[PDB]
Each structure stands twice: as structure tokens, then as C-alpha cells.
Amino acid sequence: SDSKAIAQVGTISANSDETVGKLIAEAMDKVGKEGVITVEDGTGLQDELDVVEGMQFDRGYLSPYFINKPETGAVELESPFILLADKKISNIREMLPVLEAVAKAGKPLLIIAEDVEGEALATLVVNTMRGIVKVAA
Amino acid sequence: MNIRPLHDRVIVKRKEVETKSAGGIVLTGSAAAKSTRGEVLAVGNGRILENGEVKPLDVKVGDIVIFNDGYGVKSEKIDNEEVLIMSESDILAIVEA
Amino acid sequence: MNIRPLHDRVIVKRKEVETKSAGGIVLTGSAAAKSTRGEVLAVGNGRILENGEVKPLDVKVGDIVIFNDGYGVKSEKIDNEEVLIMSESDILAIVEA
Amino acid sequence: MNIRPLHDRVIVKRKEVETKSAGGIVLTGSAAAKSTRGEVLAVGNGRILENGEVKPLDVKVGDIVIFNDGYGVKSEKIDNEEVLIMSESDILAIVEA
């Protein structure tokens, strides 16, 4: 149960490599008991441990224009309103109520669904631009 | 040079296509649509149907009106500006107040 | 700014699409259908056919009615609201009592 | 609430589709067909064509009639019942005797 012992088995398993058990022990000590752990090939020659905090997934933004502060496509919608759907939004752009409802509150907005066409994005770009509604999906 | 409609025929000019204001604050981008409103510029005498008399048109020059952009409507370049030509028939209503 | 039809043309507003209550207690979900009832808002002068005179419309501003949403029916946004425009033609009946 | 037709427009209700009694004793199942008979419920004022006057309808409220269930025929739910709407045009004859 202690991190020590755990480091010992990892180590022993990895043909006596302390670095391993050490690392592993750490990971477990972090992600927890039901925390997930996976191994991939590293860039450098040193072993490296990355730990995701909170909620996150493998999806990038469709509206590259909607980058908040930092680069690399970094968006940082401060105090947003998350939105979830079950379909794409080509010209189904109809929904401005919901939209304008926040343009009202003046809070950033995050979106999720089957997808989103430029029709929505386009307008979305200049809205968030003009300072109408800081958003992206 | 300016024009002169041919009775029944009315010369108008559309307006702003999908003006960014819908939804209130929402700056509605042009999602591949057009405008139906326009202004009265020229008025044909009046329809000449049924021989007996030639009925005047219910639209005074300059009126703000809503129309059905259909086939009967055409386009021309007057003084290098877009203009529309349909019959009073095509004109649906009028914007007031 | 409000509207003004153009004789014969009647301005209306549809109602609640498949309102949940049919079948009695049954909360009927919107099975991809639309509404046919509406409320008269504006009334054009009256038909002008057959030259002689211009016959009025049998519908007073406000009537609750049922129409055939055919081709002739169009849509617009006045003050940011959905409105329909057809000729008295399309109107079939008026809900009363 | 009940309905009020709009001149020329007649309100009726169909009847028993492929009622089992054909061939005499034979109980004819519904081989995928419909009914053409119905009862008059509401009568519109009367056609208004050709300006001059507004001709009444040759169909009193309640008649038993046969009609061509075509396009001009529509459907509606009144008090939660099926009802059809066509012009006297669509009506062909009246079951008497």
C-alpha cells in the first residue's frame, strides 16, 4: 500500500531499475487508485511523466481564429458557459436566442456537438472579434 | 438619364442582405442569403387589364416595401446602381411606422 | 416600424407546432410536423380583379384562422418576429366559439 | 370551439373505409383503400368569383355527400376529430332516398 513498496515492485519488475518504480510510484501517488496511467515513446532520452489535471480530451478547435491569449491555438475563455449538443451546425445557426442570451451576460462560451460548419464559425469569428461575444467551439 | 416604368411595372432597390443585428447583439453573418426589402423609385401608370380604364398603382414613389423576389423581377444598372423591376403584383406589403 | 399588406395580401402569425395534448393526457412529441393555425395581423385593401371595384377581405384584423401553408405563403421578420403573408385565398376557415 | 368555413370552402367528415358488407354476406377486409362518403358540417358563404355577387352553396349543413378526395382536400383536428376541407367544387353528389 505505501508508495515505497510499490516503487519496489515496479523497480524489481523493470529488471532492477529504480527510476521506473520511482516514477510509477509517483504516478500512482498522483492520479490516485482509479487514475489512469499509460506509457508512450518519449521525445528525449530521459523518461518523462506528465499528469493531466481535471477534465480534458483530444479535440482541437475548429475556429482557429478563436484563439484567446497564448499561441499554439491557446484559448482561455474566462468564466465560460459550456454548451452541449447532438448534431452539426452548418446553417442550423438558428439558436441566436441562446447565443444572444450570453452576449447579454457577457460571458465566454464553449461548445460541443457532432460538429460545426463555417456558416456558424464565420459569423462566430467576427462576433467574438468585434467584442460581441468571446466564443469558439 | 433616369427611367420611366411601363405601367404596372415598378422600379425598386433592394436593401441590406442579412444585416448583422439578428438575435439582438448577435452580429449575424451573411449565411448565403439575400434581402427582400426595397424602396420605390418609379411607378408605372397602372395596369391596363380588362380594357375599361387603366387602374393606378397603390404604391407611391419612395415607399419602403417588402416584395417576393420571383421571376417577374429583373435587374438593371442605372447610373451604375442595381435596380429591380417587377409588377405591383410582386409587391406584398409596405413598411411604415 | 409595422407593416401594411398590399390588398388581398393578409399578414398572419403561425401558432404552436404539435402542442403536446392530443390523445388526451398524451404529451405528443414533435414528430417533425408544423402548425396551420394563425392570428390575423394586417389586412390588405381587398382583391382588385375584374377591374370593376375592389372587393374587401372577409377577415378582420385579429381573427384566429386556419390556412393552407402553400407556396404563396412567405415569411419575414418584423421587430424580429416570424410572420406569414398570403392572400385570403389560402385562408380556409376561422376558429370561433 | 368550433370552426367557420371561408366561403366556397366546405367542412365535412369522411365515413367507414371499405366497410365489410360488399359481395353481400362477404366481410370485405380493408385491402388498403379509403372512403369517399362524408357528412356536411360547415358551409362557406359561397363562391365570390366574377365580382358580381357572392353565389351561395348548393349544400346545406349536414348533407350526406360523395366527393373527390383530391389535393384541394385538407385535414384538421377539431375537438380532436378528423375533418376535411374542400370547395363545393370537390363535391360531386348527394346521397338521398
Curated annotation (Swiss-Prot), chain A:
Major localization class: cytoplasm
Any GO CC annotation of this UniProt entry: cytosol
Entry annotated with the keyword Metal-binding: no
PTM text: Phosphorylated reversibly during heat shock. Can be UMPylated on a tyrosine residue by SelO/YdiU, probably under stress conditions.
Compartments where found: Cytoplasm
Domain of life: Bacteria
Alphabetical UniProt keywords: Acetylation, ATP-binding, Chaperone, Cytoplasm, Isomerase, Nucleotide-binding
Molecular function terms, GO-annotated: ATP binding; ATP hydrolysis activity; ATP-dependent protein folding chaperone; identical protein binding; isomerase activity; magnesium ion binding; unfolded protein binding
GO biological process: chaperone cofactor-dependent protein refolding; protein folding; protein refolding; response to heat; response to radiation; virion assembly
Assembly, per entry: Forms a cylinder of 14 subunits composed of two heptameric rings stacked back-to-back. Interacts with the co-chaperonin GroES. Can form asymmetrical complexes, composed of one GroEL and one GroES, and symmetrical complexes, formed between one GroEL and two GroES oligomers. The asymmetrical complex is the functional unit. It was suggested that the symmetric heterooligomer may represent a transient intermediate in the chaperonin protein folding cycle.
Family of the protein in this entry: Belongs to the chaperonin (HSP60) family.
Record function comment: Together with its co-chaperonin GroES, plays an essential role in assisting protein folding. The GroEL-GroES system forms a nano-cage that allows encapsulation of the non-native substrate proteins and provides a physical environment optimized to promote and accelerate protein folding, probably by preventing aggregation and by entropically destabilizing folding intermediates. Also plays a role in coupling between replication of the F plasmid and cell division of the cell.
Entry domain remark: Each subunit is composed of an apical domain that binds non-folded proteins and GroES, an intermediate domain and an equatorial domain that binds ATP and is involved in inter-ring interactions. Forms a large central channel that appears to traverse the entire length of the cylinder with no obstruction. The central channel of GroEL functions as two cavities, one in each ring, that are separated from each other by the crystallographically disordered 23-amino-acid C-terminal segments of the seven subunits. The entry and exit of polypeptide seem to be restricted to the apical end of each ring.
Protein name: Chaperonin GroEL
Species this protein is from: Escherichia coli (strain K12)
Swiss-Prot record, chains B, C, D:
Keyword rRNA processing: no
Gene Ontology terms: cellular component: cytosol; GroEL-GroES complex
Regulation of its function: Activity of the GroEL-GroES chaperonin complex requires Mg-ATP.
UniProt cross-references to SUPFAM superfamilies, sorted A to Z: GroES-like
Superkingdom of the organism of origin: Bacteria
GO molecular function: ATP binding; identical protein binding; metal ion binding; protein folding chaperone; protein-folding chaperone binding; unfolded protein binding
Sequence positions bearing N6-succinyllysine: 34
Stored Pfam families: Cpn10 (PF00166)
Alphabetically ordered keywords of this record: Chaperone, Cytoplasm
Subcellular location: Cytoplasm
InterPro entries associated with the record: Chaperonin_GroES, Chaperonin_GroES_sf, Chaprnonin_Cpn10_CS, GroES-like_sf
UniProt-listed GO biological process terms: chaperone cofactor-dependent protein refolding; protein folding; response to heat; virion assembly
PANTHER family: 10 KDA HEAT SHOCK PROTEIN, CO-CHAPERONIN GROES
Family from the record: Belongs to the GroES chaperonin family.
Record note on quaternary structure: Heptamer of 7 subunits arranged in a ring. Interacts with the chaperonin GroEL. Can form asymmetrical complexes, composed of one GroEL and one GroES, and symmetrical complexes, formed between one GroEL and two GroES oligomers. The asymmetrical complex is the functional unit. It was suggested that the symmetric heterooligomer may represent a transient intermediate in the chaperonin protein folding cycle. Another study shows that the symmetric heterooligomers are substantially populated only in the presence of proteins that cannot be folded by the chaperonin.
Function of the molecule: Together with the chaperonin GroEL, plays an essential role in assisting protein folding. The GroEL-GroES system forms a nano-cage that allows encapsulation of the non-native substrate proteins and provides a physical environment optimized to promote and accelerate protein folding, probably by preventing aggregation and by entropically destabilizing folding intermediates. GroES binds to the apical surface of the GroEL ring, thereby capping the opening of the GroEL channel. Regulates the ATPase activity of GroEL.
Name of the protein: Co-chaperonin GroES
Taxonomic lineage: Bacteria, Pseudomonadati, Pseudomonadota, Gammaproteobacteria, Enterobacterales
Gene that specifies this protein: groES
